[PDB]
Design a protein around this motif. Structure first.
Motif, mmCIF file in Angstrom:
data_model
loop_
_atom_site.group_PDB
_atom_site.id
_atom_site.type_symbol
_atom_site.label_atom_id
_atom_site.label_comp_id
_atom_site.label_asym_id
_atom_site.label_seq_id
_atom_site.Cartn_x
_atom_site.Cartn_y
_atom_site.Cartn_z
ATOM 1 N N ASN A 56 3.553 -6.315 -11.565
ATOM 2 C CA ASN A 56 4.152 -5.843 -10.559
ATOM 3 C C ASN A 56 3.261 -5.007 -9.616
ATOM 4 O OD1 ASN A 56 6.102 -5.124 -8.793
ATOM 5 N ND2 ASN A 56 7.238 -4.029 -9.997
ATOM 6 N N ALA A 57 2.332 -4.287 -10.380
ATOM 7 C CA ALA A 57 1.574 -3.397 -9.506
ATOM 8 C C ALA A 57 0.407 -4.186 -8.992
ATOM 9 C CB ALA A 57 0.732 -2.504 -10.662
ATOM 10 N N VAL A 58 -0.087 -5.141 -9.594
ATOM 11 C CA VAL A 58 -1.327 -5.987 -8.882
ATOM 12 C C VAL A 58 -0.459 -6.765 -7.779
ATOM 13 C CG1 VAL A 58 -2.768 -7.897 -9.171
ATOM 14 C CG2 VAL A 58 -2.716 -6.093 -10.833
ATOM 15 N N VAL A 59 0.681 -7.462 -8.014
ATOM 16 C CA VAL A 59 1.506 -8.135 -6.917
ATOM 17 C C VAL A 59 1.708 -7.064 -5.684
ATOM 18 C CG1 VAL A 59 3.642 -9.170 -6.339
ATOM 19 C CG2 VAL A 59 2.380 -9.813 -8.313
ATOM 20 N N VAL A 102 -9.349 -6.566 -8.026
ATOM 21 C CA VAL A 102 -8.278 -6.248 -8.497
ATOM 22 C C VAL A 102 -8.629 -5.266 -9.938
ATOM 23 C CG1 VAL A 102 -6.879 -7.623 -10.197
ATOM 24 C CG2 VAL A 102 -7.483 -8.189 -8.221
ATOM 25 N N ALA A 103 -9.769 -5.279 -10.456
ATOM 26 C CA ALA A 103 -10.261 -4.272 -11.429
ATOM 27 C C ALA A 103 -10.053 -2.950 -10.638
ATOM 28 C CB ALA A 103 -11.502 -4.425 -11.647
ATOM 29 N N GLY A 104 -10.333 -2.538 -9.618
ATOM 30 C CA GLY A 104 -10.215 -1.201 -8.859
ATOM 31 C C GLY A 104 -8.649 -0.748 -8.902
ATOM 32 N N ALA A 105 -7.997 -1.650 -8.268
ATOM 33 C CA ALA A 105 -6.607 -1.625 -8.228
ATOM 34 C C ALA A 105 -6.121 -1.125 -9.645
ATOM 35 C CB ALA A 105 -5.879 -2.907 -7.698
ATOM 36 N N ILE A 106 -6.355 -1.881 -10.574
ATOM 37 C CA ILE A 106 -5.939 -1.546 -11.898
ATOM 38 C C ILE A 106 -6.544 0.021 -12.413
ATOM 39 C CG2 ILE A 106 -6.062 -1.958 -14.485
ATOM 40 C CD1 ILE A 106 -4.275 -3.694 -12.693
#
Lengths: 102, 50, 417, 52, 52, 52
Positions: free
Chosen positions: F20-23, F47-51
C-alpha cells in the motif's frame, strides 16, 4: 537552603554553586510544577515536585560538576517557611547522595 | 504426574505446557525462534518450548 | 492567531490566565468590532469567560500528563508502570469478624451500627441486627470505621452507644479473625519496591551469592569461586566441567535450611553446583542439602554447597614488660578478638585467609602500645591434634581456600622473659 | 564492563586466525572481583578497517 | 636499615606512605611507643607490627 | 511488476503495508515526488528511497 514564600506562583533567582540559577514554582491542578533555568538558558519545563526525588532528572542537565535540588516532602505553597524546604547540594555531596539512594 | 528429572546437559533449556492453559500451538510455533526475542535466555543456552 | 506553540523540545509551557484572557478578548474584538463591550453581564462577555476557562483547562490538563512513563509520576499511571514488572493496589479492607458474644436481657433487639470500644480506645461497629435467646448469649458481626489492619486486644469490650438492658460485649477465641489489608503501598514505597527489584536484578552470580549468603543470620564469611575450566585454577574442582564452588563459614549456622534457601534464590539457570574431588571442604550432607520445595508455587529441586575444613593454630610470644604493667590474659584476649575480626579495618581469619605472626604483633601493637615484643611465632595443625613439638613453629603459614583457622584462649602461651 | 555482564562458566573465546586482531595475547586480567578473588580472564577483539 | 615484603592489601596504598610510618616510630611521635633511645632494641616485630 | 527482498530485523512490518505504501507512492503522496507520469521511467532505487 533556598528562601521561599507562601504565594501560589513565584520565581526566585540566586547565585549558588558557582552558577546562576532561576527557579519558578506554580500550582497546576493538583500538584506543583517547576521551571529551572541556568545562565539564562532554560533547562527544563514543568518538572513535578515530589518528596525525596531530585528535580533534575538527566545527566546532561544536572552535572558534569554542578548541583541539584530536592524537596524534603511534597510541596504545598501554604506551608513554605514552616516545615517544607528546598535544599541545594553541590556536586560532590549530590553524587554521594545518589550513591546512597540505592 | 512425573517430571523430567535430568534435562541432561549444561546450557540446555526447555519449557513444559499443560492442557489447562489451552494455549494454541501457533504461539508455541512462533515462540521457539530467536528472531522475535520474546523469551528469557542466558548465555551458552539453547531453549525449547516443549 | 493568538495561538501559541507551548509544547517545545524542553517541555510544556503553562501560561497565566491574564494572558490567555487578553488573547481571547483580542480574538473576539477582531471578530466583532474594535469597540465592543466585554463584561460579565453582557452575553458575549459570558462567551469570553467560557472560552478562556476551556482553553486554560485543556492546556493545564495536557501539561499535567506531559511526562508520565518516567518513574516519578503517581496516581494510576505509575501503578501501570509498576505492574509492568510487579505490583498490587487497592488493599483497603477492614477486619470484619464473626462469632461475637452478647449477654443481654430476654427477647430484645440490638439496633444496628452500635458502637463498640476496646481497651486502647478504638471504635468498632456492629453489622447485623439480632435478637437475644432467653438463655442470655448470642453472636454479632463487627467492623471498624477506618480501613486499617486493626488488631483487637482480647479483652471484654465496653459500650459506647447503649441499648436497653444489654451489656458486656465480651471476647471469645472461637471468633473468626480476619486480618485485613490496609492501603499498604500508596505512592513512595512503590518506588522503593522498584529500587529493591532493580538492585536484586543488577548483580551477577558471584555478587548475588555473596550478598544473599551474607544475609542469613549468624553467618561469618563466605568464599565463592568459579572453576572456569576443567582443570585446577585455585582449587581442584574437576568434578564437573563448569561448576560453581561455594564455601560458607559460620559460627554454628543456627539455620541449616536458610543457607539452602538463599542459594536457591540465586541460581543462574544453566550452571551446576557440585564441586571438589573429595579433597575440598566436607559438605554438610552428601547428595543434597534437602531444600524447601519452592516459596512460589513450585516443585522440589536440589542444590549443593560445602563448608571449609576447620583448623587451629598455636602462637608463641616472648615479651618484655618494659616501663609499665600489662596483663597476660589481656594480651591473649586481644589476640583472640583480632582473630574473630572485631577490630575495625582488618577482616580477620576468614575462610581461605592465612595468618602470620607479624599480623598478631600488629594487633598487639595497636591494642596495647608501651610494650616491647621480642619474638612471636605461629604454627597451624588440623583440628583436635595434640600439642605439636617446638619445631613446628614458622614465621608464616599458608592456608588452602577451603581451610579456616581458629584460636582459643588457652591455646596462646606467653613468656614474660 | 565485559566481566560485569557475563555469568557463565567459560564464555570467553578467541575466534581463530581468521578474525579481528586480539587486543591482548593471553587474556585481559580483570584483577578485582566482588568476592575479592583473584580471577583473571577477559578475551575480546577489534574489527578490521576496510574501505568502501 | 628496614626492609619489608607486603601484599597488595585492600586499598591502593602508595609505596611512599609506608616509609613515613617507621620514621615517626624512630622519632617517637606515635602515642604509646617511646621511640629510638639509648639501648633501643631495634626489632622487626616492634616496627613492622606498629606500621599497621 | 516489482519484487523486493527485505530482512525483517527486529520490527516486522506487514507486506500489505509495504504494498500500500509503494502503491500510494506511485501517485506521489509524498512531498517532492510527482509520481508515474507519462513517459517517466521507474527505477528500483526510487522505490528503495520510498521505502527508506
Amino acid at each position: 537552603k533556598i528562601p521561599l514564600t507562601a504565594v501560589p506562583n513565584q520565581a526566585i533567582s540566586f547565585n549558588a554553586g558557582s552558577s546562576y540559577w532561576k527557579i519558578r514554582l506554580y500550582q497546576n491542578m493538583d500538584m506543583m510544577n517547576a521551571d529551572i533555568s541556568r545562565d539564562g538558558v532554560i533547562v527544563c519545563h514543568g518538572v513535578r515536585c515530589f518528596g525525596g526525588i531530585p528535580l533534575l532528572q538527566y545527566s546532561h542537565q544536572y552535572r558534569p560538576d554542578y548541583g541539584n535540588f530536592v524537596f524534603d516532602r511534597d510541596a504545598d505553597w501554604t506551608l513554605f517557611g514552616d516545615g517544607i524546604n528546598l535544599f541545594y547540594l553541590d556536586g560532590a555531596e549530590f553524587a554521594e547522595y545518589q550513591a546512597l539512594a540505592t | 504426574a512425573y517430571i523430567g528429572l535430568p534435562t541432561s546437559g549444561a546450557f540446555k533449556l526447555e519449557y513444559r505446557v499443560g492442557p489447562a492453559l489451552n494455549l494454541s500451538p501457533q504461539l508455541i510455533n512462533l515462540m521457539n525462534d530467536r528472531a522475535v526475542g520474546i523469551m528469557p535466555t542466558c548465555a551458552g543456552c539453547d531453549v525449547k518450548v516443549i | 492567531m493568538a495561538n501559541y506553540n507551548y509544547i517545545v523540545d524542553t517541555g510544556v509551557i503553562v501560561a497565566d490566565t491574564a494572558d490567555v484572557l487578553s488573547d481571547v478578548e483580542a480574538e473576539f474584538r477582531a471578530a466583532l468590532g474594535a469597540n465592543i463591550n466585554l463584561a460579565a453581564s453582557t452575553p458575549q462577555g459570558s462567551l469570553v469567560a467560557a472560552e478562556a476557562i476551556a482553553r486554560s483547562s485543556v492546556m493545564r490538563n495536557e501539561a499535567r500528563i506531559a511526562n508520565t512513563i518516567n518513574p516519578n509520576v503517581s496516581f494510576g499511571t505509575f501503578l501501570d508502570a509498576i505492574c509492568a514488572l510487579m505490583g498490587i493496589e487497592r488493599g483497603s479492607d477492614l477486619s470484619t469478624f464473626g462469632y461475637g458474644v452478647q449477654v443481654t436481657g430476654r427477647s430484645q433487639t440490638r439496633i444496628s451500627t452500635g458502637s463498640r470500644v476496646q481497651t486502647p480506645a478504638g471504635a468498632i461497629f456492629t453489622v447485623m441486627s439480632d435478637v437475644t435467646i432467653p438463655a442470655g448469649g448470642v453472636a454479632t458481626i463487627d467492623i471498624k470505621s477506618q480501613e486499617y489492619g486493626n488488631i483487637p486486644l482480647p479483652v471484654g469490650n465496653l459500650i459506647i452507644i447503649d441499648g436497653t438492658i444489654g451489656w458486656s460485649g465480651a471476647k471469645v477465641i472461637a471468633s473468626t479473625r480476619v486480618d485485613p489489608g490496609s492501603r499498604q503501598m500508596s505512592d513512595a514505597e512503590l518506588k522503593n519496591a522498584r529500587v529493591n527489584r532493580l538492585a536484586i536484578q543488577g548483580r551477577n552470580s558471584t555478587m548475588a551469592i555473596k550478598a544473599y549468603v551474607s544475609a542469613v543470620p549468624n553467618v561469618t564469611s563466605v568464599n565463592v569461586i568459579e572453576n572456569n575450566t576443567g582443570a585446577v585454577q585455585v582449587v581442584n574442582g574437576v568434578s564437573f566441567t563448569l561448576p560453581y564452588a561455594v564455601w560458607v563459614c559460620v559460627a554454628g549456622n543456627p539455620d541449616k535450611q536458610a543457607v539452602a534457601d538463599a542459594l536457591w534464590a540465586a541460581h543462574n539457570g544453566g550452571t551446576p553446583w557440585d564441586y571438589g574431588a573429595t579433597n575440598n571442604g566436607v559438605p554438610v550432607d552428601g547428595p543434597n542439602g534437602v531444600p524447601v520445595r519452592d516459596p512460589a508455587s513450585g516443585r522440589k529441586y536440589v542444590v549443593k554447597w560445602t563448608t571449609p575444613i576447620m583448623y587451629d593454630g598455636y602462637v608463641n610470644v616472648t615479651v618484655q614488660q618494659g616501663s609499665s604493667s600489662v596483663a597476660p590474659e589481656a594480651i591473649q584476649n586481644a589476640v583472640v578478638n583480632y582473630a574473630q575480626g572485631k577490630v575495625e579495618g582488618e577482616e580477620g581469619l576468614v575462610v581461605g585467609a592465612s595468618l602470620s605472626a607479624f599480623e598478631v604483633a600488629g594487633a598487639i601493637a595497636r591494642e596495647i602500645p608501651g610494650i616491647y615484643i621480642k619474638l612471636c611465632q605461629v604454627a597451624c595443625v588440623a583440628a583436635g591434634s595434640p600439642a605439636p613439638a617446638p619445631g613446628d613453629f614458622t614465621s608464616e603459614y599458608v592456608m588452602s581456600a577451603f581451610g579456616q583457622a581458629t584460636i582459643s584462649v588457652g591455646n596462646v602461651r606467653v613468656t614474660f622473659v
